[PDB]
Ligand binder design. Structure first.
Ligand code: DGL
Ligand code: DGL
Ligand code: CA
Ligand code: CA
Lengths: 267, 267
């Protein structure tokens, strides 16, 4: 019921960008996170495989009785959102449309860029979403396969990351974009680097963070909000990979000392 | 269909405060409005009667194939939202929760006031909503029975309106409120007067307007947004009262010269 947790799934630590913002806007909601680290990256995988893996993660949390499911993953939202939403009795939230709505609102020169995994770009989800809202906007999409690995290796602040981002985003430097969507939930971890590379005049859109606003309204629409007090059970973090590696990134990113995660199996 | 209209219902011209904002944020959505002017005000009517009338209005628009129903009336939202939402196959949007979420975010001293009809205040919908989010917030509620009549009689900018608002709102003076929810959709038509009576330091919350943001995200969640182009059919306005009286107010408030309404019957 209303006291159950909101579940969030992703290929790894990416979904944490949705969870971090949820800790801020919805401090009284209990969260259960699952990052399929063992199979990350989902980016280059075939659509049907991402759908399969997404269902496996969804099934894992459904067992935990979640009252809402957030696909805190652009790659998975692009190919699995519609199917999962139609199948489940609980609200199912994707992260693409919230980011698309936000970018459309901030652009002044109608030049919006979108960076994401090979899978998200291949699906054209962002291009399609932006066109369904404002066709006049020129959308530039770019897949950045090298970003997730450096986030997952916990080097998103290293010199290695600064060079990777600079080289990759060079393809966008001559477009004159005034807006760039971080179409991969792993990317906000590289936000300071991406911002420096793009320039102070480019507004970055954190799609995962933008989704929390929707989650908030959906809790009211479906009338399933937690009571306005701290949950009696703590947030739970699961990963198919090393709990130790996951905790080092999560603890630092979320600013939660000694955060602990559990290694589980999916298959 | 994504091309059908979004319907809005209210006791009279108050719902126009939701519609006006919809024309701004959702230019490509076709709208059908119905104000039950003949039975306005709903404010002092028993809850069961308001439910009855609200269903008749909803039924009237459902017959026009609306893809979404907006109860642009706090009085009706307070007592009929739950029932209507559970019964219809289309999204049903109330104006109370959006206003409560906005108010909670803007208050600094946690002292929020809310003005509305006798019915809205009697239901305590706002008090309950705000307490369900931030119980620390002190809510001051006040029914303003004289407000709707002066809006309906097209006197909201007259000198008599200044007297009535000041006399009525004296109950909220020196209460330390830094936020006031306009909990009746007719009230935004009296905004400048209300703002002057309360201080320029008090943030006014237009619940009806706040609801449009939710409508926008719901169109995406349910994937039923109109194509990004002006609809091929114009907006429609209906009233159970004088069309001439309705158009006089509507055309002025919306800034739509020669707006035309149709008088119809409900029962
Ligand atoms: N973090 C997910 C998937 C990243 C990946 O596994 O490649 C996304 O937003 O696209
Ligand atoms: N305008 C409606 C009802 C006003 C009335 O009929 O009294 C509301 O928001 O309360
Ligand atoms: Ca990739
Ligand atoms: Ca009243």
């Amino acid at each position: 019921s209303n006291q159950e947790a909101i579940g969030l799934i992703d290929s790894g630590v990416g979904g944490l960008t949705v969870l971090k913002e949820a800790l801020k806007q919805l401090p009284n909601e209990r969260l259960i996170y699952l990052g399929d680290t063992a199979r990350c990256p989902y980016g280059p995988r075939p659509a049907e495989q991402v759908v399969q893996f997404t269902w496996e993660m969804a099934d894992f949390l459904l067992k935990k009785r979640i009252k809402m499911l957030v696909i805190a993953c652009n790659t998975a939202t692009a190919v699995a959102l519609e199917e999962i939403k139609a199948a489940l009795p609980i609200p199912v939230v994707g992260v693409i449309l919230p980011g698309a709505r936000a970018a459309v609102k901030v652009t002044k020169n109608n030049k919006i860029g979108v960076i994401g995994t090979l899978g998200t770009i291949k699906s054209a989800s962002y291009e399609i979403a932006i066109k369904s809202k404002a066709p006049a906007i020129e959308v530039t999409s770019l897949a950045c396969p090298k970003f997730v690995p450096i986030v997952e290796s916990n080097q998103y602040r290293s010199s290695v990351a600064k060079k990777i981002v600079a080289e990759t985003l060079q393809a966008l430097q001559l477009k004159g974009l005034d807006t760039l969507i971080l179409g991969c939930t792993h990317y906000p971890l590289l936000r300071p680097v991406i911002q420096n590379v793009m320039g102070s005049h480019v507004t970055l859109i954190d799609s995962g963070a933008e989704t929390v606003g929707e989650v908030s309204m959906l809790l009211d629409y479906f009338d399933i909000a937690h009571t306005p007090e701290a949950p009696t059970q703590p947030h739970e973090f699961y990963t198919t990979g090393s709990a130790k590696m996951f905790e080092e990134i999560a603890s630092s990113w979320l600013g939660i000392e000694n955060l602990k995660a559990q290694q589980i199996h999916l298959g």
